[PDB]
Amino acid sequence: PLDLALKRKYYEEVRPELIRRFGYQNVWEVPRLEKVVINQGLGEAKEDARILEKAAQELALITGQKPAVTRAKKSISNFKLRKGMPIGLRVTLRRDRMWIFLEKLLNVALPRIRDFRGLNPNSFDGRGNYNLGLREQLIFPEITYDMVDALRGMDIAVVTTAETDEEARALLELLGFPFRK
């Protein structure tokens, strides 16, 4: 499925404008959106694989991709975790798999976010990267209402090939990332 609105948006719209604002030398100095990863730190369904599955396959639909598990290492008596038994539901995705998800996101999810006001401008980690938390996971397309047995949210991170985050700010704004500014 090599082709899509957002896929091209970057090329035939954003990309060239970056050359305006910064204007590099080589085509590979122009900042690439190239990595996006979901995650669900769930010490919640940590007990049972029942509450753990639905959140995984649910995740699977929104991403469209096959979600991965992540086990604990240390040990937390304060919140009942030892060897690695438990869980965090993370899933990496790139290529066109990600463009398709970002379209949904920046144009369907963020929109239906209760009293949205634009992605926090400060969520950039000094380097060319951005992350954000989300409550209700139902703000995703295919997700039905009668489907959710819990409002288990989650958080995501998106990587650039940029070095500084002004380039990432510029890059993301252009790509349709509504920032609170």
Binding site: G64, I100, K104, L106, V108, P141
Partner: peptide, 30 residues
């Protein structure tokens, strides 16, 4: 499949995601 984001404010978007019956309430067109 090619998804179909049907919203009450036009903006009917296609992409890819199982079952294209995507009735979006208030999409980014508004």
């Amino acid at each position: 499949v090619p998804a179909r984001i049907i919203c009450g404010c036009g903006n009917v978007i296609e992409t890819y995601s199982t079952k294209p019956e995507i009735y979006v309430e208030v999409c980014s067109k508004c």
